[PDB]
CSV table of C-alpha atoms in Angstrom, one decimal:
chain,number,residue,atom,x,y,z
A,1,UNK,CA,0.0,0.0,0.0
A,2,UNK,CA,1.1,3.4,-0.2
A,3,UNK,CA,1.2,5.6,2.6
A,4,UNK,CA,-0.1,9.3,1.8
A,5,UNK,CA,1.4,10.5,5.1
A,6,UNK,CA,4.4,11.2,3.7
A,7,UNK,CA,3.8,14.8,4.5
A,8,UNK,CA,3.2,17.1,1.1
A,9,UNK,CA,-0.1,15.9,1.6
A,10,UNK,CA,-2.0,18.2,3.8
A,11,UNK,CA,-1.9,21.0,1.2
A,12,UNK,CA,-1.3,18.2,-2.0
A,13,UNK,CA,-4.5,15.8,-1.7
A,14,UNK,CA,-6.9,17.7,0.3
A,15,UNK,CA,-6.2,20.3,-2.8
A,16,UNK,CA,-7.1,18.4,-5.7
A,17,UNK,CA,-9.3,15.6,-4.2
A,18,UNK,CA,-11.7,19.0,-3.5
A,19,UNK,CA,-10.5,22.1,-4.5
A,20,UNK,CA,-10.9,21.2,-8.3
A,21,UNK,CA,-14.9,21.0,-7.4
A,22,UNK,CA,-15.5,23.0,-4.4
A,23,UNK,CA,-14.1,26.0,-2.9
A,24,UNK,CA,-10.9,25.6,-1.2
A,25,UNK,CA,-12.6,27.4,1.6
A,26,UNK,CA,-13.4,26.9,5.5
């Protein structure tokens, strides 16, 4: 498996796993 808590991540995946459809917003 591949662990995503390599680090980058917090900004990376919560980026494009949303922020391509919603607003990157709070």
């Amino acid at each position: 498996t591949n662990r995503r808590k390599s680090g980058k991540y917090k900004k990376v995946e919560i980026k494009e796993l949303g922020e391509l459809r919603k607003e990157p917003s709070l």
